[PDB]
Paper text:
Here, we describe the structure and function of the first member of a family of protein phosphatases that is specific to fungi, protein phosphatase Z1 (PPZ1) from Candida albicans. Like other fungus-specific phosphatases, C. albicans PPZ1 (484 amino acids [aa], 54.4 kDa) has two domains: an N-terminal intrinsically disordered protein (IDP) domain (aa 1 to 170 [PPZ1Nterm]) and a C-terminal catalytic domain (aa 171 to 484 [PPZ1cat]). PPZ1cat and human PP1α exhibit 66% sequence identity throughout their catalytic domains, and the 6 residues that coordinate the active site metals are 100% conserved. Furthermore, not only is PPZ1 important for cation homeostasis and cell wall biosynthesis, it is also critical for C. albicans virulence.
In order to understand the molecular consequences of the sequence differences between PPZ1 and PP1α and the role of the PPZ1 C-terminal residues in PPZ1 function, we determined the 3-dimensional crystal structure of PPZ1cat to 2.61 Å resolution. The PPZ1cat structure includes residues 171 to 478. As expected, the PPZ1cat structure adopts the canonical PP1 fold, comprising a mixed α/β protein, whose central loops are positioned to coordinate the active site metals. The most significant difference is in the N-terminal region, where the PPZ1cat helix A′ extends for one more turn compared with PP1α and the loop connecting helix A′ to helix A (L1) adopts a conformation distinct from that in PP1α. Although the sequences of L1 between PPZ1cat and PP1α are only 33% identical, this change of conformation is primarily due to a single amino acid change in helix C, Tyr144PP1α to Cys309PPZ1. The much smaller cysteine side chain creates a hydrophobic pocket into which the side chain of Val193PPZ1 binds. The rest of the PPZ1cat L1 conformation changes to accommodate this new interaction, which in turn widens the pocket defined by helix A′, L1, and helix B (referred to here as the “Z1-helix binding pocket”). The newly widened Z1-helix binding pocket results in the second significant structural difference between PPZ1cat and PP1α: the C-terminal residues of PPZ1cat are not disordered like they are in PP1α, but instead form an α-helix that nestles into this newly widened Z1-helix binding pocket. This interaction is stabilized by hydrophobic interactions between the C-terminal helix and residues from helices A′ and B, with the interaction centered on PPZ1 C-terminal helix residue Met473PPZ1. Finally, the experimental B-factors for residues in the Z1-helix are higher than the rest of PPZ1cat, suggesting that the Z1-helix is more dynamic than the rest of the PPZ1cat.
Residue numbers in the entry: 169 to 478
Amino acid sequence: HMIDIDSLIDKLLNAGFSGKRTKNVCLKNTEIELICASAREIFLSQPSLLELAPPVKVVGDVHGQYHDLIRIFSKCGFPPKTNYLFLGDYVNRGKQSLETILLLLCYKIKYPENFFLLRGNHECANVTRVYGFYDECKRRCNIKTWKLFIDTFNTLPIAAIVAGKIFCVHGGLSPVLNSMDEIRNIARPTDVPDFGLLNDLLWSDPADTINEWEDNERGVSYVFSKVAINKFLSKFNFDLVCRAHMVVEDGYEFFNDRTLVTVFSAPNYCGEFDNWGAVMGVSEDLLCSFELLDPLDSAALKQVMKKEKQ
């Protein structure tokens, strides 16, 4: 029997609109298994480097903040009337990583040509072991379920080009990125390597450094200067680098005279930063606009979920 994607999405949406956290996921592990297999099939069939036509809305980190994800869809439009590109980091830190990733995967399944998910640095075995998702899988489901997600994470595409002009990646640039074909030819499935192209694309950060490339003092990959950005844009004839991978107070933040933008969509990240979330709309004429989401507490979020149910 084939996947009842309508019934799965409904259960997921209902779980979110309840505002309630349950130890049991509203979906059976067999259903979770089917979702991961279906999504995996699509990921491997579509290119490693997505090439998307506008309009589209770009979403940064969500990090398990499921109620905020629903706020995003409510405010920016539900699929498939609104086209989405997510920049990765769907799990860890947040309270409802499972609901979050499952809903995103289901939408990918139902609308494979209008809905897109990139790989973030958190979508790997190493990081999920540390910041909650492995423990959440073990506690709410099992370790076998976790492994299935990792198998699925390993097949995610790495980068996207919007309208031939906006380069989209989770982390940033690489010192060993010679051509777009190198991203296209990243073999999948794959774990995140400790070094190399894929490691850089997920972990690099921009900085106003003196050298084009220096070691990232966050511990992984490199930091790249304004010059590196200007060179990259000029080499591949791009206008904008759109990335995530960093919490910013207003949900978004331009750099190097608006040639790079950081988009972050987890309001009040870690419960500590009190940041806004942002979603970047890219018009058919390549105009970039920003819809913002303010940080709500647990009680206000529940009220918005209560509200949105009608």
